[PDB]
Amino acid sequence: LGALRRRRALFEKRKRLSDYALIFGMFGIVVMVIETELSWGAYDKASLYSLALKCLISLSTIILLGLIIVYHAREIQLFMVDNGADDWRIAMTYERIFFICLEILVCAIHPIPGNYTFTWTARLAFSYAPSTTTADVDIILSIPMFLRLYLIARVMLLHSKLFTDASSRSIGALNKINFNTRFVMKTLMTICPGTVLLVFSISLWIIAAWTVRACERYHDQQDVTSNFLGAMWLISITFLSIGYGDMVPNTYCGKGVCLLTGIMGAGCTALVVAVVARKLELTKAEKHVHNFMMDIQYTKEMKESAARVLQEAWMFYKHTRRKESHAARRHQRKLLAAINAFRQVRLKHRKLREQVNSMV
Amino acid sequence: LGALRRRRALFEKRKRLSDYALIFGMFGIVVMVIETELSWGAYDKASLYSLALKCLISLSTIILLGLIIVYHAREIQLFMVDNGADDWRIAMTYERIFFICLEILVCAIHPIPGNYTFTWTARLAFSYAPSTTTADVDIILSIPMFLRLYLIARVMLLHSKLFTDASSRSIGALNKINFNTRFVMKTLMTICPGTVLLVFSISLWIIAAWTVRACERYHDQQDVTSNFLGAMWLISITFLSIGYGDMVPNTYCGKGVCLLTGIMGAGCTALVVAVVARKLELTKAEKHVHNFMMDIQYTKEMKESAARVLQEAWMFYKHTRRKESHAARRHQRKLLAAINAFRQVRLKHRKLREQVNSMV
Amino acid sequence: LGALRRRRALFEKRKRLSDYALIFGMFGIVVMVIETELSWGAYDKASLYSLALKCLISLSTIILLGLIIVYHAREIQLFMVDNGADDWRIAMTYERIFFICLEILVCAIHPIPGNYTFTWTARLAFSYAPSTTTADVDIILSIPMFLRLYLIARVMLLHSKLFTDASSRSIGALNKINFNTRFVMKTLMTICPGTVLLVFSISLWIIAAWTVRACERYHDQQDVTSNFLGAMWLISITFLSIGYGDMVPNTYCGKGVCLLTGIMGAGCTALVVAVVARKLELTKAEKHVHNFMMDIQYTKEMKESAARVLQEAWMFYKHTRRKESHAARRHQRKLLAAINAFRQVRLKHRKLREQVNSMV
Amino acid sequence: LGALRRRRALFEKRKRLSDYALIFGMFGIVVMVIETELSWGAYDKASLYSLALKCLISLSTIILLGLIIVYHAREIQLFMVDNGADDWRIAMTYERIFFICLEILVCAIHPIPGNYTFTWTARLAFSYAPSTTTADVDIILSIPMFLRLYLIARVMLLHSKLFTDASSRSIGALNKINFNTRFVMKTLMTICPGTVLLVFSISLWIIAAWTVRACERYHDQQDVTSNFLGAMWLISITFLSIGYGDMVPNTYCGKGVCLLTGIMGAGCTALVVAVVARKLELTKAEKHVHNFMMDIQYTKEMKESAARVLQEAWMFYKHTRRKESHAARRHQRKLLAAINAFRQVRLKHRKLREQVNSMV
Amino acid sequence: QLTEEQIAEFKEAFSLFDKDGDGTITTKELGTVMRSLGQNPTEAELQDMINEVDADGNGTIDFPEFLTMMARKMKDTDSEEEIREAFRVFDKDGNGYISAAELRHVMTNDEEVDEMIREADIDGDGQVNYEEFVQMMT
Amino acid sequence: QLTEEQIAEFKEAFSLFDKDGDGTITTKELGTVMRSLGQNPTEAELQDMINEVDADGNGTIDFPEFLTMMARKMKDTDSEEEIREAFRVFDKDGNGYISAAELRHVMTNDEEVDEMIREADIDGDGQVNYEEFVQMMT
Amino acid sequence: QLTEEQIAEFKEAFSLFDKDGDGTITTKELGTVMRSLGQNPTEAELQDMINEVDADGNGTIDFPEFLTMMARKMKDTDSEEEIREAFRVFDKDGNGYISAAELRHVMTNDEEVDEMIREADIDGDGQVNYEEFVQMMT
Amino acid sequence: QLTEEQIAEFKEAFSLFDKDGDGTITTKELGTVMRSLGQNPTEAELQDMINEVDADGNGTIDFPEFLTMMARKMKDTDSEEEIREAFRVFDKDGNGYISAAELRHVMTNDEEVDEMIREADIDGDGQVNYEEFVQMMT
Ligand SMILES: COc1ccc(S(=O)(=O)Nc2cccc(C(=O)Nc3cccc4nonc34)c2)cc1
Ligand SMILES: [Ca+2]
Ligand SMILES: [Ca+2]
Ligand SMILES: [Ca+2]
Ligand SMILES: [Ca+2]
Ligand SMILES: [Ca+2]
Ligand SMILES: [Ca+2]
Ligand SMILES: [Ca+2]
Ligand SMILES: [Ca+2]
Ligand SMILES: [Ca+2]
Ligand SMILES: [Ca+2]
Ligand SMILES: [Ca+2]
Ligand SMILES: [Ca+2]
Ligand SMILES: [Ca+2]
Ligand SMILES: [Ca+2]
Ligand SMILES: [Ca+2]
Ligand SMILES: [Ca+2]
Ligand SMILES: [K+]
Ligand SMILES: [K+]
Ligand SMILES: [K+]
Ligand SMILES: [K+]
């Protein structure tokens, strides 16, 4: 009982630190977007507004790094409490240190205050004419800022009900299930697949479109693929694997984003196919009700088709006995057609009965 | 028994009002198409013919709004009779009022009589040259008129046999099933998937093609993508995700229709895959007959292959005893080949027997 | 016994007439291809060679029509013998007459001898420049000659073993199965799907490529899409839904063939997906062997991981008792890693045991 | 026992020869790539460096042919030992000789030392302007050198654990399983499908890109599709079936490589779909945990919904008894909403119970 | 009364369960129909369901009782069934009588519950039953 | 008579059911084949379907009887089986005899049915049997 | 001690197994829950796993014992269970006692194993038991 | 003789069937392994397949007998099993002895078969047995 209290008090701190890290990461990304958009036309990179906004980004990044460090300290304490260790060096393996350094590196890339520039040259598309420019260096540090979206997955995993619930944890432990983020992803894809597939793709559509526009606004004097509704058209027709061609990227960054978009679209067609195939299958009760309704329908059709068979047979007999030939032949043709129809409905009814018997 | 009579008398009125609303909505759409096509070349937007046709559209829209209101009044009365209420204010929730207003807004968008114009500017494709025009305002009200096709789904649901039949209603309610339009869609996709997929896509092909042509005939002095068989080519190669490029939309409306076409094509490839996968599977009786036929075939093959094995073995023995070598090695090779073939057919027969035993 | 002899003697005649009709149809198509290819450059449409070749096509078409008529007479006699009729008018329904007329019309379209021309105007692609020509009328009659390939399906169905075999027919009728061409297609797709999908698509590749080249050689002064290896490139990138764009059809015929190619490619991706999904599944005999091998592997891994756990635990204990700290901490870390690895392999073994138990 | 030791010694010799053949084949391919890259700009085809590198390729090819011959001799000896033959002519069938000759021909194609050239003409894309160059003949022999990658499959099959293990071979023999390379491919695709699909495609990406660049550097004065990152862009957008169009091959070799890339991309979409569909499914141990958690959730929801039903019913009763109307109607609406919500949650709980009973 | 078409449709629905045509729906016929629908009903539950609409208590459902059941089942939501299910899930102990303890427990998901008990206990037996619950709900 | 190839194929089809080679298809062998085909025939139904072509009534199918069964089963549709099934579904009561009540009932899905009964009752027993049904059909 | 929220959640988890609410988890209730989870535990294995945390040996799990079981089960990996499983797979003969032969055999997948045995036999009974194994592990 | 690695691998394969480690594979252990592989062997077939390699006839497979079985099973195709299966399918009557009638019948799928019989009957008993079949095959 001396371990459960500490473990819960550390679960709460870990969750709160994840929440705050997500808040500060998203604030940094949003201010980066605002500053990148404004510094193009509203003011220049030497203005005091740019200095203030980049100072805000840096001050958010410092606090984010602090929160990441404190989160990892809490997780080290959790490892201590779990595996009954006493020295923190025991918890520090090679993989853990590598992942701590990876998170710190990912979360420490941001536009540093100050004006720096580099010469950017690209080959224009459909004309192959070189175009050079003096682009700022803050654009190769703004794009990596979108890597802070792993905090979203961390927060989703940590806030999930069955991750922290005592009863859910016990039931998972009896069945030896690991509650990693893949289990959460699978449960989401089996509960609400359409909602996940519609949020995860329309939230990445805007990100890819903004990345393409930001990368290509330096080599675009026509406002064709450096316009937001143009970049968002390019990315959509790349994701859907249409690829018209009138808007093809000029730069390596735009081409890379379009390649990544194409890869993810080819990986999302598989998800769409799986979801659609699982959404057409009839539920067991629905299939039983449908089979019962079709059984009633086939019995009614069989009754009326047998009635028609006898009606046509008698009409043919009456016309034959009435010393008539042409109408007798017409009604013999109708009798043959009625017999064929009766055979068809009988076969359909038998197939339905076989399916029902196999199901039950 | 005092409620069943009223409920049936209201079911009939509800169905009749749905039928009339569909009739008037389709009449409005058809007259809109006729007037849009004629006012381009036959006459001008100031002519009396245009005034007469737009008056016809407006008079159809007024009656459609009246029928929608009366249908919702009948549905309110049905709610009263079902849940045993007495005051109609009880039936009026927030969602119901929102949906009533949504239907009224959707069904009240039509070309108002009179000449109104707005300046439309677009960036031409593959040349990026701006093109401005004085386009009429009736084209941004004609395109939304295709939203009246939800009345088609409403009529299909209301006219369905199992929605109104007392027998089907009893059987479904015994199994606790909701008879919404998704159940109808699933039953259609499991009974006649090809017919539904061929009607729902070739009827939307014409609609998308007409929308593209109508939107882009204002910025097309070459009759390339403003020709009906050209718009119908563009839409088809977008839906199939080919996307050649020679016909890429100029305007935002054409680009939006092409994006919607691409999305629906990427969603219909999943339906095609599911339907094809469900149409290749052999039914139980067909699989049993096929397995029986293959069992007979494999038994015949095994008989003839054992015969060949013994024939080759004896021929090799006879040539060996006949003081011959070259024919002896030829027939030893043939005997080894015959033994391998016999092993292959025996393994195939064993696999077939295992499959039959697992199935039965 | 007086009906079985007649029925078999008519089955044989029906099969022979189908064979001869296929022979003459393919001969007509081949001579059409030869004449179309030669009359472009080798000679002109007024030459005697063209007259001779078109006379050969016409004389093959006359015999094909005769064979179709005789085949339908034999099928009428088969209907007589089956349904015990006596007057041939009884067998002549509306559908049968419609299909007889449809086959005769399909098989009577061929290049008539004589020179006739019509003015063909097309809009060139990527330049929208009109191009007019005086094209022969024999090209709108040569392309429909590829509709004679239904005789291929008829011959495949009539020559199939289970269609005419007495035992196969008895077993099929005992299970109430119709031996139509869809059953044959399904059995082919379940026996040899790759072979069918590779023959039916590479034989239509040549047909579509030749049709595109034949239709577009009249409006192509650059030998770009009127070259056989260029048309065969266009058709291949359309079928695979790549659609580069450098070769986009000029004429309505080329565009229609490319649309049909795109549709069939979007319908064949579904077949490819189904075949691949059915070809990755492990059979029961393979799955049992794989599970046994993995069981042996997991037992060996579990043995060695328990050995490592005890080895590391003892090394840590020995270093602790040896008044050492740094190596004791290193070996405690190694012991924790070994315990985690042992847990992982134990969980994998338990999952394998659960899967084996569920399968058996 | 006199055959087992010989069979194992020949297994070991066969495996070692396969390893050495793979080593020498890969060395030849690597030196071919180095020489092809260097001879473009670093030196010319008449230099002594080119002579030395091509002599190295030839000396690797001679040793590779020797190793292939010795490997086939070892297989002949294995056939002798297996089928108890005495004369090696017994083992030399037609298929075996054909495959020996095929491997020797495939492994004997390499750049012969010496300067030989041929005139290469191609039609440029999007301009259709002919371009002629005096290209070396060593480029039509370098590209076929990538066919030596079948040694990779041979080494993977021969080194596989279950191919040579005695216990695995015995277990496979009891179940009559053939240990061909298709079984190995299926086991790999069922154990680690993502890793195989990510190695086999990102290792062919560089091969196709290098082939395109090598073939088209002779007809590219703009360094657009003859640049490695440009060829690797073209191949990637062809594999994903986007096909922009700005980079479309000029020569027949580039077009053929792009056609093969498109075919393999259309065949790999099926593998992606199958893998993704098999990776979304929840295993039994996860399905049971998920169902238990959702059952607990639904019971809690039912409790709170019944609480709301009674609370709203009592509030409505109290407001009715308190001579109030507006609040009475509002709370009656709330009670009806609560009853509907309770019905919905009860229905979904019943559906969960039905699903649990069906799977258990 | 009901029109001819309604009577014909409801007689067809009745004959769905009435296989032998004797005019009454024996519990065995309802059981076999629900088995054909994929359900697995116990005899106790079947009997409980068949006396839900059995007005005369004879143990079988004739045409008028079936008409009442249809007039209560044709609507999208049946208030009586939902009220009964709510009362059932209120009764944790399953004895058919909800005391103040269960109500106080389920309200927490003092004066108000006391007023509810006071105004719901029509017979003054110190507890709440099904008839009191349906009286308070309506 | 039948040629050598036809009789050979039909003998092979006969031996496909005749495992023991005694020349007669016992009902047990037909049931075993039917079970191997995935169907589950009852003994009563199997016996009823084995006397359909059994002309001599010996209880087994010899070669000529099997030839007759094939000669009526090779055709795509046989009028005899469809007529029998129609007569079976006409007889709701299952007694083998259709009276005027069932005829009038199934005709609604007066003078015409009276004429049908009058001209269909060949023996004048007041009711319609299977022989009268097949006489009227042909 | 534990806070109100923790004890409430653990009481809910305890009642998830404790249907009758008597305060003790009998082996039958745990078996029923395990069967509802898809597994099939034998009575012997179930009893063996129920005395693992049963400190007083009364045969049932009270609340404090369940709290101890949770306190050792909440962690991602518990050393006790892994050590026990390793000891179980060490004992090939299944007698509960590992002698030097099995140790030497499993170490091959001389002086070192002798030192291990010498320093692991705390009681000097000539063989290694579970208590000695857990003493050496910690 | 076999090297250390080969004998170790074959001993492991032998112990894969030999659970109890007594050195002999009883038919029960082989049946259990076969059932674990998904197949269902009858006792008669299992005994028949266990005496194929049992040289001494003791009823169990020792290590040398298992080595012989592996030495004839490691190869991709063994002529002995294929010859035995061919002889089995030759003998339609199942009596173990093929007479001239079955040979003449299967050869149609006069002098040649007479020569085959004359040169295949080594003992001159007038009929062909398994030993004569394997003598003629080799
Ligand atoms: C559409 O399915 C996909 C499968 C896997 C992947 S992936 O990201 O793992 N690999 C990947 C990424 C980008 C380009 C390529 C690429 O062009 N490959 C190839 C080129 C030429 C011949 C090939 N034969 O096989 N692959 C080939 C591959 C993505 C989508
Ligand atoms: Ca009854
Ligand atoms: Ca009653
Ligand atoms: Ca109570
Ligand atoms: Ca009371
Ligand atoms: Ca018999
Ligand atoms: Ca007989
Ligand atoms: Ca009757
Ligand atoms: Ca009679
Ligand atoms: Ca208890
Ligand atoms: Ca206790
Ligand atoms: Ca031991
Ligand atoms: Ca001890
Ligand atoms: Ca043993
Ligand atoms: Ca022995
Ligand atoms: Ca014999
Ligand atoms: Ca003999
Ligand atoms: K595409
Ligand atoms: K494209
Ligand atoms: K495309
Ligand atoms: K394109």
CATH number at residue D314: 1.10.287.70
Q: Confirm whether D50 is domain-assigned.
A: yes
The answer to whether residue D241 neighbours chain B at the CB level (below 8 Å) is yes
> Could you tell me which chain B residue has the CA closest to the CA of D332?
B90
DSSP D150-184: HHHHHHHHHH-HHHH-HHHHHHHHHTT----HHHH
For D356, which residue in chain G has the nearest alpha carbon? G36
**Does a structural domain hold residue B310?**
yes
Of E37, E76, E79, the CB nearest to B174: E37
H127 labeled binding residue: yes
Closest CA to D333 of B96, C347, B137: B96
Between the CA of F97 and the centroid of ligand 9 the distance, in Å, is 8
Instruction: Name the burial class of residue B148, with classes exposed (0-12), middle (13-18) and buried (19+) by CB atoms within 10 angstroms of its CB.
Output: buried
Closest CA to C60 of C105, C115, C114, C111: C111
Q: What are the residue ranges of helices labelled H in chain D? A: 4-41, 48-83, 94-107, 139-142, 150-159, 161-164, 166-174, 181-191, 193-202, 204-216, 228-239, 252-280, 284-321, 326-359
CB-neighbour burial class of residue D198 (10 A; exposed 0-12, middle 13-18, buried 19+): exposed
Breaks in chain A after residues, C-to-N cutoff 2.5 Å: none
CA C312 from chain centre, in angstroms, equals 61
Which residues, at least 6 apart from C156, have a Cβ–Cβ distance to it below 8 Å?
C181, C184
- Per CB-CB distance under 8 Å, the chain D contacts of E85 are 306, 342, 346
Distance CA B36, CA B54 (A): 10
Cα separation of F114 and F126, whole Å? 12
The phi and psi torsions of E116 (rounded to 5 degrees) equal -60, -45
Closest residue by CA, ligand 1 atom 19: D205
Q: Is residue D94 part of a domain?
A: yes
Ligand 1 neighbours (beta carbon < 6 A): A 263, 266; D 197-198, 201-202, 204-205, 208, 235-236, 239-240, 261, 264-265, 268-269, 272
Residue nearest to atom 26 of ligand 1 (CA): D201
Q: With respect to CATH, is domain H3-76 assigned 1.10.238.10?
A: yes
Check if the beta carbon of residue C284 is closer than 8 Å to that of residue B358.
yes
CA distance D278 to D288: 18
Is C285 an 8 Å CB contact of chain H?
yes
Return the structure tokens found at H8.
Answer: 């170790």
Would you state the structure tokens that stand for residue D342, as one six-digit string?
């309770």
A132, exposed or middle or buried, with CB in 10 Å at 0-12, 13-18, 19+? exposed
C177 touches chain A (CB under 8 A): no
CB neighbourhood size of A230 (10 A): 22
Residues whose CB falls within 8 Å of the CB of residue H121, separated by 6 or more in sequence, listed in order: H127, H128, H132
Smallest CA-to-CA distance from C242 within B231, D258, D212, A239 is with D258
> Torsions phi, psi of C122, nearest 5?
-135, 155
- Residue D74 class from Cβ within 10 Å (0-12 exposed, 13-18 middle, 19+ buried)? buried
Whether B228 is in a domain gets the answer no
Instruction: Considering only the beta carbons, identify the residue of E1, E13, E39 that sits closest to B166.
Output: E13
Chain-centroid distance of CA D293 in Å reads 38
Q: How far is CA C279 from CA B105, C273, C276, C319, G49, in A?
A: 53, 10, 5, 56, 44
Q: How far is CA C187 from the centre of its chain?
A: 14
Give yes or no for C288 touching H (CB within 8 A).
Answer: yes
H121 is in an annotated binding site: yes
- As given in the structure block, the two tokens for residue C340 are 């985690």
| F10 close contact with C: CB closer than 8 A | yes
Residue pair C172/A347 in contact by the 8 Å Cβ criterion: no
β-pairing, C117-123 vs B130-136, is unpaired
Tell me the one-letter amino acid at B259. Answer: L
- Beta-carbon neighbour count of residue A53 at 10 Å? 21
Picking from C224, C243, C293, the nearest residue to D168 by CB comes out as C293
Mutational test site, ligand 1, from D202, D212, D232, D263, max ligand atoms within 8 Å of CB: D202
Q: What are the tokens at B204?
A: 């939307």
| Tokens read off for E108 | 């927490």
Tell me how far apart the alpha carbons of residues H91 and H89 are, in angstroms, rounded to a whole number: 5
Distance CA E20, CA D359 (A): 35
How was this model experimentally determined? cryo-EM
Domain boundary residue, one of B96, B114, B132: B114
Residue nearest to atom 29 of ligand 1 (CA): A263
Cite the beta strand spans of chain A per DSSP E.
117-123, 130-136
Instruction: Count other C-beta atoms under 10 Å from residue F87's C-beta.
Output: 21
Q: Residue A21 region, left (φ>0) first, then alpha (ψ -120 to 50), else beta?
A: alpha
SS (H, E, C) chain B: CCCHHHHHHHHHHHHHHHHHHHHHHHHHHHHHHHHHHHHHHCCCCCCHHHHHHHHHHHHHHHHHHHHHHHHHHHHHHHHHHHHCCCCHHHHCCHHHHHHHHHHHHHCCCCCCCCCCEEEEEEECCCCCCEEEEEEECCHHHHHHHHHHHHHHHHHHHHHCHHHHCHHHHHHHHHCCCCCCHHHHHHHHHHHCHHHHHHHHHHHHHHHHHHHHHHHHCCCCCCCCCCCHHHHHHHHHHHHCCCCCCCCCCCCHHHHHHHHHHHHHHHHHHHHHHHHHHHHHCCCHHHHHHHHHHHHHHHHHHHHHHHHHHHHHHHHHHHHHHCCCCHHHHHHHHHHHHHHHHHHHHHHHHHHHHHHHHHHC
Tokens found for residue A74: 């809490």
Please name the residues between 292 and 321 in chain A that touch chain C, using a CB distance below 8 Å.
none
Alpha-carbon Rg for chain A in angstroms: 34
Q: In angstroms, what CA-CA distances link E32 with E16, E19, E36, E74?
A: 11, 10, 6, 22
Distance CA F91, CA F98 (A): 5
Number of C-alpha atoms within 13 angstroms, CB side, residue H45? 6
DSSP conformational letter for C118: E
Subunits touching C (CB < 8 Å, at least 3 pairs)?
A: A, B, D, F, G, H
d(CA D20, CA D63): 9
Instruction: Report how far apart, in Å, the C-alpha atoms of C213 and of each of C134, C139, F14 are.
Output: 17, 11, 57
Instruction: Measure CA A42 to chain center.
Output: 35
Domain contains A347:
yes
Resolution for the entry shown, Å: 3.3
Level-2 CATH architecture, domain F77-137: Orthogonal Bundle (1.10)
Whether D267 sits inside 8 A of C272 (CB atoms) is: yes
**Subunit contact D244:A245, Cβ cutoff 8 A:** yes
Torsion of CA D84, D85, D91, D93, to 10 degrees: -100
Taken as a whole, chain G contains a residue count of 138
HSE, side-chain direction, 13 A CA sphere, residue D13? 18
Nearest CA of chain B to the CA of E125: how many Å?
31
Distance from CA of G102 to the nearest CA of C (A): 11
Q: Which domain holds residue A143?
A: 1-113+138-159
Q: What is the dihedral of CA H77, H81, H83, H85, to 10 degrees?
A: -120
Interhelix angle for E100-107 vs D284-321, to 10°? 110
| Tokens, residue G124 | 């000097």
G135 annotated to bind ligand: no
Residue G40 contacts D where some CB pair is shorter than 8 Å = no
The answer to whether the beta carbons of residues B307 and H107 sit under 8 Å apart is yes
Q: Do E103 and E127 contact (CB within 8 A), yes or no?
A: no
Q: Where in chain G is the domain with CATH 1.10.238.10?
A: 3-76, 77-137
H-run or E-run covering C121: strand C117-123
Determine whether A11 is exposed, middle or buried from the number of CB atoms within 10 Å of its CB (0-12, 13-18, 19+).
middle
| D-chain residues near A190 (CB < 8 A) | 280, 282, 290
Ligand 1: residue of D199, D201, D240 to mutate (most ligand atoms within 8 A of CB) is: D201
Whose atoms come closest to the Cα of H88: which ligand?
A: 16
Task: Please name the member of B178, B245, B329 whose beta carbon is closest to the beta carbon of D90.
Answer: B329
Euclidean distance between CA atoms F91 and E110, whole angstroms: 71
| Residue D75 contacts residue D96 (beta carbons within 8 Å) | no
Write the burial class of residue C249 (CB in 10 Å: 0-12 exposed, 13-18 middle, 19+ buried): buried
Of F106, F115, F136, nearest to A303 by CB-CB distance is F106
Least distant ligand from the CA of F133: 9
Closest CA to A185 of A196, A201, A172: A196
Helices (H), chain E: 4-17, 27-36, 43-50, 63-73, 79-90, 100-107, 111-120, 130-137
Which letter does DSSP use for residue C283 in this model?
Answer: P
Among D122, D152, D182, the domain-final residue is D152
Angstrom distance (rounded) from CA C274 to CA C196: 14
The number of distinct structural domains making up chain A is: 2
Strand partners, E25: E61
